[PDB]
Design a protein around this ligand. Structure first.
Ligand SMILES: COCCCNC(=O)c1nc(-c2ccc(S(=O)(=O)N3CCN(C)CC3)cc2)cnc1N
Ligand SMILES: COCCCNC(=O)c1nc(-c2ccc(S(=O)(=O)N3CCN(C)CC3)cc2)cnc1N
Lengths: 350, 350
């Protein structure tokens, strides 16, 4: 087959380029970003994904700058990066060589939906916990993903490992600095975003994660609608009408606009009867109008819902051991170091 | 089988309630604020749609107040309205008895898309002209639809009559007064809305109409995306990067955030080679960054693209005559009375 050799800089460590050779190049994605390819490294045989984006000469790429700073088991690793000329002549392309993760939460949730089944609760705990770990990590550097949704949550079906991807919308949120409100995908957008707030915090990712949890429990999105107004009606139907105080906490320019007075629906009636109460309690605490009232990713990791993961006897349906879940760093725990008493169970240290 | 008799007030004219009897009640829609039913009038056999929404004593219904003021051949008519109940007591329901129009532009566009075909250009002219006439009409009263999309454009396949529906998002836009930016459905939202502008005009409906025209020509939406950012990238890919002046016209709180410098793409390369040049020129003039640079609905009606409709020999593929197209009122022409020289062809008014 066709072998491509490049002089690629490693993602982490010293800026010491290396000759990287790859083959079996197939397109696996095409979006607003650019093209995502799958390729096989000639040396190891290891599979990788290559994200190709057109680079302006104007400034450095924000996604690369973010990717270069990250190293977490629940985040797709930037292995290398290199420049090329691909489709258009006289223009540069930045190529991000990333870890290849075979499946998405989106496709898996879709399989179960189609078969009129729900994803077993063990997987809901494994996938959600791992998402909150990745969130605790990026948030500790002040970085907000801004596009949390099932399509951006990659899975290894054999190892039950989840890895966060797509750092195209990611930004370091600095207090007092304004940010675009038009980020985030329909169904997963926090009410502050729907209200066009430019002063939002990293708690927008928490709302999105909460929407993902409720969807895995229901078998469909919790807040659907093709307009902000329809989405808001669906939110109000569950959470009840937001107070004048709750509106101020999201966007204070929408306080004088009247809303339909709907009663605060009991969260227990939202989900099927078999739904564990700790799962319902977790949604309740993540899907809050007041951005500050939402659990943090690290607090979410420590929630009762994830206790089965901390059991020393927990195993995968395939018999294998659970992936890494307790290897927390000082950085990862920085928001609340005492939480490590809950997070790291006695059997963990080895 | 079941016959329902009500004392309904007629939509237009004197407040003279009448006994209205209807049967064969089936649900035809379930949306944001309630249910849409189809029913047969016992005393004509004529089909109607009944929109059932929960009413608050706090305020009069905005949709009802808008509906009562309207009478146009290209707008679904409010025949009657009455009050009743449907849920667990104390709750009052407003019922809007409307004209029943059998098909939607959405379903029809979908048929052609599935058959790998495009809707014949004669229908693109007939449907788009009629939409602009309905827009010229509502806009003449200062009323903005705010949710223009294929699902809200009803059709009679035999008569080629298009009728605008859904006045749930409709509002009278008063200059200086702020309005919610979270109205309008994904794909059809004007860039000012994506940028969270609360100072938008009725030209948002023109952008939406332009998106509908381009979609009927392409066989798919012109600006897709699940996020505002993705939609904006698709807009920039066609229109080129908006200038700081153009950004100011939309939302002057986003003039500081820098955009990807993409060249102004030629509109001719957007559509298939067969596409009429006047259709391309029309999209170009409707899909403009600067809200004031967009054609008005009445100016759009008078565009070269619609000339075939003004031909005295024009007929339907089924042999029938074209529906009413030239019966303009003083109200309808009020924005620019001289346009009637183009709009009313010599053969009309002989
Ligand atoms: C997925 O979202 C794209 C955003 C950036 N992509 C990634 O970070 C990334 N994506 C993938 C990835 C791309 C496509 C899929 S998929 O749609 O499930 N898919 C299964 C395998 N097929 C052969 C191709 C089709 C599954 C994973 C793999 N490694 C990555 N490193
Ligand atoms: C659909 O628009 C939503 C806004 C409220 N609806 C209306 O005002 C309204 N809708 C309809 C209408 C509703 C649904 C359809 S449909 O989905 O194409 N449909 C075709 C006939 N089927 C038997 C049922 C299914 C076709 C027309 C008719 N008259 C109306 N007056």
């Amino acid at each position: 087959s066709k072998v491509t050799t490049v002089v690629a800089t490693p993602g982490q460590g010293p800026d010491r380029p290396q000759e990287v050779s790859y083959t079996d190049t197939k397109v696996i994605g095409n979006g607003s970003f650019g093209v995502v390819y799958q390729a096989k490294l000639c040396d190891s045989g290891e599979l990788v994904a290559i994200k190709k984006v057109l680079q302006d000469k104007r400034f450095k790429n924000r996604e690369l700058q973010i990717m270069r700073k990250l190293d977490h088991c629940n985040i797709v690793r930037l292995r290398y990066f290199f420049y090329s000329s691909g489709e258009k002549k006289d223009e540069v392309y930045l190529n991000l060589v990333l870890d290849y993760v075979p499946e998405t939460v989106y496709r898996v949730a879709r399989h179960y939906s189609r078969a009129k089944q729900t994803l077993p609760v063990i997987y809901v705990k494994l996938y959600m916990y791992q998402l909150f770990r990745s969130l605790a990590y990026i948030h500790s550097f002040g970085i907000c993903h801004r596009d949390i949704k099932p399509q951006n949550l990659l899975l290894d079906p054999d190892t039950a490992v989840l890895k966060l991807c797509d750092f195209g919308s990611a930004k370091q949120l600095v207090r007092g600095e304004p940010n675009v409100s038009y980020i985030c995908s329909r169904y997963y957008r926090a009410p502050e975003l729907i209200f066009g707030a430019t002063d939002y915090t990293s708690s927008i990712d928490v709302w999105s994660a909460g929407c993902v949890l409720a969807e895995l429990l229901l078998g469909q999105p919790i807040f659907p609608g093709d307009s902000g107004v329809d989405q808001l009606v669906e939110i109000i139907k569950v959470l009840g009408t937001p107070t004048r105080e709750q509106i101020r906490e999201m966007n204070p320019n929408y306080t004088e606009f009247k809303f339909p007075q709907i009663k605060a629906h009991p969260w227990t009636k939202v989900f099927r009867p078999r739904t564990p109460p700790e799962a319902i309690a977790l949604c309740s605490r993540l899907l809050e109008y007041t951005p500050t009232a939402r659990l943090t990713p690290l607090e979410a990791c420590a929630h009762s819902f994830f206790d089965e993961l901390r059991d020393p006897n927990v195993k995968l349906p395939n018999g294998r051991d659970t992936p890494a879940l307790f290897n927390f760093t000082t950085q990862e725990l920085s928001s609340n170091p005492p939480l490590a008493t809950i997070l790291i169970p006695p059997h963990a240290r080895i």
